Amino acid sequence: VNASPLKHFVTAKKKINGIFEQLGAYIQESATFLEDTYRNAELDPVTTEEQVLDVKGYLSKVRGISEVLARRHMKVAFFGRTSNGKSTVINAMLWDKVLPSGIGHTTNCFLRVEGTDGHEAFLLTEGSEEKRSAKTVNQLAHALHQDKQLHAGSLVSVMWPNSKCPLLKDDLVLMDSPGIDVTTELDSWIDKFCLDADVFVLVANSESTLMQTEKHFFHKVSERLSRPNIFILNNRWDASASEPEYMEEVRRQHMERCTSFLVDELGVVDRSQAGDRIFFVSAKEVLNARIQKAQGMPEGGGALAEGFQVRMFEFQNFERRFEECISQSAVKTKFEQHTVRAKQIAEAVRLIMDSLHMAAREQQVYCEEMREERQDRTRENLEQEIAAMNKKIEVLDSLQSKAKLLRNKAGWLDSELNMFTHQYLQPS
Ligand SMILES: Nc1nc2c(ncn2[C@@H]2O[C@H](COP(=O)(O)OP(=O)(O)O)[C@@H](O)[C@H]2O)c(=O)[nH]1
């Protein structure tokens, strides 16, 4: 978790999935015990049909939740005016040209990059549900054009091999968006694609300023989400090297504008945190440097202007703050409610087990007093009637002991869930 913060999410996901398997086993064991106890015709009922059916229903519910928990992931979504550099930023983070991001190109739809354990990339168009190959980035871009049905509300998933990008292997999904100016029905974008985003990145043009259409979208994000994690990349900052008489003053103005936006307008970060959310970068520099590095050549070959390493460190600082943020936030956001659910379900089963225990114990006490009163009713058959009473007392004592043991197992699950909560669900 010190090496790559995203392993925090990977490890949390493994742990809570494993707890849910143990919970399923426990509920299964309990259901079998209840069902056998309900069927016992040698005793007055110590359980009800409602308890049997409730516990079976909890098993069904827990197996459904396991299916959801297995698919949970971190999601970062990128927004900004066309040609600010969104696709280049994504490609830079993935160390490769995954999404089309060249000159003369515009992406008209949402693109969603997700890892696959497969050996080849491929495309999945949502809604239409067809699968196409994407062995090169020109082949992908060819596929987005020949699909005339794609519009600003469409989404195509790019399933990219895991072995290439640790980000993707560690359960991160990256979402690219059409230019922010393409529509004003931006409510639709948030409904469809953003409510499960753990981090939002505004990729702005550092050559100009934050556009009002860009800020307006993040006003709406703040309306829909509680303290959303918002980063601002002032991209294309290599251009500033061309205007050195302005660069430091322009940086100061941009920084104050962006800080005012996040702190005083949205109120989603404090002023002392703003330096960890706003960065001045050249995504094209980073991408080309990493492509060179990946192929075994100096990273300096990616430089577009004087000051390459300064801008590179700024992008690496962004990535570090990003991974620290998304891993901690997504673990809490994506697992807290199922953790609470698992505690409620375990408690309901514990309650049922304790009720069986009490009912058996009470019936056992009744038999023990019946046994002691036999001596006043029977002398010749006293020992046989006592021995028959003893058999029923032993069956009830066995039920009470087993029920008590299963009740106690619920406490083991609740303690595992509390330790998960302590390690992974504390607020920041
Ligand atoms: N000089 C410079 N060019 C960039 C930078 N980032 C992207 N570009 C170029 O700007 C054009 C648009 O970039 P792209 O990532 O496709 O923009 P998008 O529409 O926001 O996704 C492409 O030709 C990129 O290579 C940058 O930091 N500096």
Residue numbers in the entry: 24 to 400, 706 to 756
Task: Pull text from the paper.
Outer mitochondrial membrane (OMM) fusion is catalyzed by the dynamin-like GTPase called mitofusin (MFN). We generated a modified human MFN2 construct with deletions of residues 1–21 and 401–705 (MFN2IM). MFN2IM contains a G domain and a helical domain 1 (HD1). In this study, we address these issues by presenting crystal structures of truncated human MFN2 in different stages of the GTP turnover cycle. These structures explain how MFN2 uses a primate-only single amino acid variance and a tighter G interface, as compared with human MFN1, to allow for enduring GTPase (G) domain association even after GTP hydrolysis, a feature that is unique in the dynamin superfamily and ensures efficient membrane tethering.
